[PDB]
Amino acid sequence: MQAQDWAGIPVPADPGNGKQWKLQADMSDDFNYDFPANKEETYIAGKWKNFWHNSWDGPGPTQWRHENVSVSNGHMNIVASRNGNTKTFRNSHDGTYHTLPATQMGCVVSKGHVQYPVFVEARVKIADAVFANNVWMISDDDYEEIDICENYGGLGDPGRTGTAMNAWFAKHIHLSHHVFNNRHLTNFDDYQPRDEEGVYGTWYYENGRTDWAGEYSTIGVYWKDPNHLEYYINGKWVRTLSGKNYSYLDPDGKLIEASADFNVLDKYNYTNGKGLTKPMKLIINIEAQDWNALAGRYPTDGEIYGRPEDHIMKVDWIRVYTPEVVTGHH
Ligand SMILES: [Ca+2]
Known part of the structure; x- marks a missing residue:
């Protein structure tokens, strides 16, 4: 088996003292196979449903369609297109x-x-x-x-x-x-x-960066415990929420460390003191939300028909790891 696409790219979070990361196979994929666009509901590779989790077709003038998801050319493709129908x-x-x-x-x-x-x-x-x-x-x-x-x-x-x-x-x-x-x-x-x-x-x-659309980005979260989340962009730490404390890099690169008078994960105690615990599915999608679309922040015909390949969100890979104690010489 060849090394996966992420091989040699370290996991940027630390798994704990005397721990190592273990790939969670059922939630990890580097999308280097062909899955042609399909009008029927399908779990791609047995892992990724080509739709929302029920028959609702989305917010605003969004129309989620099974055939607007494919895998080709080393990435999953999440496609915007326009047939002229109104919503x-x-x-x-x-x-x-x-x-x-x-x-x-x-x-x-x-x-x-x-x-x-x-x-x-x-x-x-x-x-x-x-x-x-x-x-x-x-x-x-x-x-x-x-x-x-x-x-x-x-x-x-x-x-x-x-x-x-x-x-x-x-x-x-x-x-x-x-x-x-x-x-x-x-x-x-x-x-x-x-x-x-x-x-x-x-x-x-980040001061100077106008958008995130011209190259690949990596974005990840370490959901460490029910009161601890850390976010990483392009392999670099940017933000932690931990109990009543949180810290982050501001747009000028400055470290901001803050302390609130309440728990910043569950401010009003809607989890009955448990924090974030419930198992979660991963969702990757594109949408045109009502607020944006009504403002005109919505693809023009000139844009969507003139640059179709730009109207695609591409996913080179998804990887998931959980911490395990080190195992010794094997
Ligand atoms: Ca790939």
């Missing part, structure tokens, strides 16, 4: 329906699960296109989620003005997680770290 969708901020040309898109959900202690990392080439490129994880009951990467793609073709400009969005990677409460209610609760909750730095960016 009518609700503006989540006020409850009203709007109609736009739809974008057919892809969504992938793992068969397997991960649970702490675990390191999850993907090598992706974010689409050079105006849409969301997401890598995230969620428990089967939808109560506990970790967001490895939420990013909004490229700057688009010339001619965008006002709210349709994507520069603020394109430069960031959102590093976050959610714990929910009372999802049986309509008005369920959602806690995530953010400025308004007193947890800073969640929208990562």
Whole structure:
């Protein structure tokens, strides 16, 4: 067997004293096989469902389609395309329906699960296109989620003005997680770290870097324990949340170390003191969310038909490791 694509690339998190990382086979893939686009529900390689976890076809004017996921040329392809059909969708901020040309898109959900202690990392080439490129994880009951990467793609073709400009969005990677409460209610609760909750730095960016769409990036999380998450971009540590403490590299490269008066993983104790524990599936998808699409941050026909190969989120590999004690001379 040849070395996998990630061979020789160290795991950037530390597994603990006298521990080593062990690959979790059922959640790891370097995508060096052919899987042609398929209209039918399929677990690719027995591991990656070519759709969302139910028949819902997505937010906004998104239309997830089984045939918008393929594997070729060393990567999984998550494709945006446009057949001209419209989709009518609700503006989540006020409850009203709007109609736009739809974008057919892809969504992938793992068969397997991960649970702490675990390191999850993907090598992706974010689409050079105006849409969301997401890598995230969620428990089967939808109560506990970790967001490895939420990013909004490229700057688009010339001619965008006002709210349709994507520069603020394109430069960031959102590093976050959610714990929910009372999802049986309509008005369920959602806690995530953010400025308004007193947890800073969640929208990562670097002075000078306009977007993440011109090359491959690696983004990963070490979900170490129920009150400890660490994020890594391109093999480098960028952010830790640990109990009531958190730290991160700011956009000028400065280390910021902060201490909150509350637990920053579960501020309002929606987990009944347990923290993040529930097994999670990995989701990789692209979408056009309502807020973005209504603002004009949505691919034009000129963009999507003029540069089709840019309207694809590519995944070179996904790798998952769990810590094991060192084994000695074997
Ligand atoms: Ca590959």
